[PDB]
Design a protein around this nucleic acid. Structure first.
Ligand code: DG3
Length: 534
DNA sequence: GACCACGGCGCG
DNA sequence: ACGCGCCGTGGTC
């Protein structure tokens, strides 16, 4: 810092850069700087100076690296103080917060940013000393991962624009039809997009019972859950739910996506955020490609839009019940571990209401998804369509079949209260203080956040590690990693190597880290994201 | 134009 | 009575 010294910087310096916007793929490089040995180096011309650097180290290294790859420059990201802070406390998600917290100030000048990166790393890195397990995550997962992610953000994914443009016109017509029908029943036109106007119409201008109310402002809710219960109580309801689906997918996916194709690449680029979640998961944004619809017919039509480059094929890899398996391993429950040991499908195997294996099943498929979150009979009976206590009775059979689960939940909650945090299999930790709150609702909310983190975070660790190990193997085969959706990966491979890439990636993922239970991966190849599954 | 809270909903 | 990001609305600055 302080002493201004001419560019270029000495090797191994901390970089501070300024972008016109957050998205590195769309951002103009306004300023570039570096700091080292107590010196500040401000580049005369940012874009040119980019060539000098050998690797990116400093706050938000990956982003600068992404922009570098955009310009043909092979500039890999390295140390990033944000990554260290994220490992100390996953609540450290922003440079504004991190700086303020560890001896600095997040500015709009590259030099002060570069200097902030230098001292911020010194301090933070010191706080990580002794934390063997965290250091291991930083070196063996986080740091290397930042590079893999940088290459995914720069590669982007191919989108069938004309297809979506056409789908938009068809959906527009169907929306108009539902709009006219709803207005007819309402006896008058209003903003069907306005849940406020909808509330008045539904519960006041109609004999419709208000089931629940909104959290913050306490209005009569018009959530899908509420409307579901009223689907028979009125024709207009079903038409409103259908209107909801269409408008949701049209305004969020169908319309905005085509307009996001990058001019240089001709592909769709998302940002994979590394210090965003409280559990250790990745997040996707601008645009979010981890929530592309798939569960409904209309959603699946949208998913077909994501296609492979010509001469290429999409390879889709999904872990199967990875969080359940993580639980089986974390808890040590034999009667569960031995369900994945025998390769026996849990949902039907845990369909032990009587004996499989084989009738009421899928009621367990929702119990298994449900135990991870700590859902009670209410969310259960409602989503399963059964009496309130024809749901409670269920949940208790579960803890009797799998006692070691309850024991683990109990275990970690106790651990959490004591030291103030919980952790994953690899020692990634999340601080959750409200475990000692005197208000039950608040405390029981903290508890759910608390015992879910180790499970969801461990699965995140496994996927991350699997990506770090899988990446180099893909480069050697001229294949590329496109997207990650928490428990699934999407690769793009040349048709010829497609099947080879598929088999390899599968094994890299199944053996990423052996547990007291085998990890199972489903693999699919196709010209589009949808067909690449099944 | 920007950013906001909110209700709502897409995905794992 | 889990984890995210984005939409339109309604609203402010
Ligand atoms: N984490 C999470 N994932 C969900 C939820 N609802 C749906 N999904 C996604 C995750 C994977 C997929 C369900 O995968 P399963 O583990 O049921 O495996 P499957 O192939 O669907 O088996 P089956 O067809 O027998 O249900 O749907 C949810 O509430 N939480």
């Amino acid at each position: 810092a302080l002493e201004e010294a001419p560019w270029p910087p000495p090797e191994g310096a901390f970089v501070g850069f300024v972008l016109s916007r957050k998205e590195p793929m769309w951002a103009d490089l306004l300023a570039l700087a570096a700091a080292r040995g107590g010196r500040v180096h401000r580049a005369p011309e940012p874009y040119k100076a980019l060539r000098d650097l050998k690797e990116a180290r400093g706050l938000l290294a990956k982003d600068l690296s992404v922009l570098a790859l955009r310009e043909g420059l092979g500039l890999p990201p390295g140390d990033d103080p944000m990554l260290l802070a994220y490992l100390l406390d996953p609540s450290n998600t922003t440079p504004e917060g991190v700086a303020r917290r560890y001896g600095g100030e997040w500015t709009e000048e590259a030099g002060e940013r570069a200097a902030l990166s230098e001292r911020l790393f010194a301090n933070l890195w010191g706080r990580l000393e002794g934390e063997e397990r965290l250091l291991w995550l930083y070196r063996e997962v986080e740091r290397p991962l930042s590079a893999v992610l940088a290459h995914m953000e720069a590669t982007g994914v191919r989108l069938d624009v004309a297809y979506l443009r056409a789908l938009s016109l068809e959906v527009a017509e169907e929306i108009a039809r539902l709009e006219a029908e709803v207005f007819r029943l309402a006896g008058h036109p209003f903003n069907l997009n306005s849940r406020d106007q909808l509330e008045r119409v539904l519960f006041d201008e109609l004999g419709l019972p208000a089931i629940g109310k909104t959290e913050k402002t306490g209005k009569r809710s018009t959530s899908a859950a509420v409307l579901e219960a009223l689907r028979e109580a009125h024709p207009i309801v079903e038409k409103i739910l259908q209107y909801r689906e269409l408008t949701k997918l049209k305004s969020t996916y169908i319309d905005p996506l085509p307009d996001l194709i990058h001019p240089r690449t001709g592909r769709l680029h998302t940002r994979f955020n590394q210090t965003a979640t409280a559990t250790g998961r990745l997040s996707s944004s601008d645009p979010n490609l981890q929530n592309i619809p798939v569960r409904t017919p209309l959603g699946q039509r949208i998913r077909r839009a994501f296609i492979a480059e010509e001469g290429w094929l999409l390879v889709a890899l999904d872990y199967s019940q990875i969080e359940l398996r993580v639980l089986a391993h974390l808890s040590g429950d034999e009667n569960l571990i031995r369900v994945f040991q025998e390769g026996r499908d849990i949902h039907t195997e845990t369909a032990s209401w009587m004996f499989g294996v084989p009738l009421m099943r899928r009621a367990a498929k929702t119990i298994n998804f449900g135990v991870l979150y700590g859902m009670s009979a209410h969310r259960l009976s409602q989503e399963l369509a059964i009496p309130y206590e024809e749901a409670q009775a269920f949940i208790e059979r579960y803890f009797q079949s799998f006692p070691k689960v309850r024991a683990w939940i109990e275990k970690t909650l106790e651990e959490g209260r004591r030291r103030g945090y919980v952790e994953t299999l690899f020692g990634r930790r999340r601080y959750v203080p409200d475990l000692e709150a005197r208000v039950k609702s608040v405390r029981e909310a903290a508890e759910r956040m608390a015992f879910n983190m180790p499970v969801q975070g461990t699965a995140a660790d496994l996927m991350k590690l699997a990506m770090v190990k899988l990446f180099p193997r893909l480069e050697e085969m001229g294949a590329r990693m496109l997207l990650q959706v928490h428990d699934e990966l999407v690769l793009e491979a040349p048709k010829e190597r497609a099947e080879a890439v598929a088999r390899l990636a599968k094994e890299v993922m199944e053996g990423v880290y052996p547990l007291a239970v085998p990890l199972e991966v489903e693999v699919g190849i196709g010209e589009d994201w949808l067909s690449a599954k099944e």
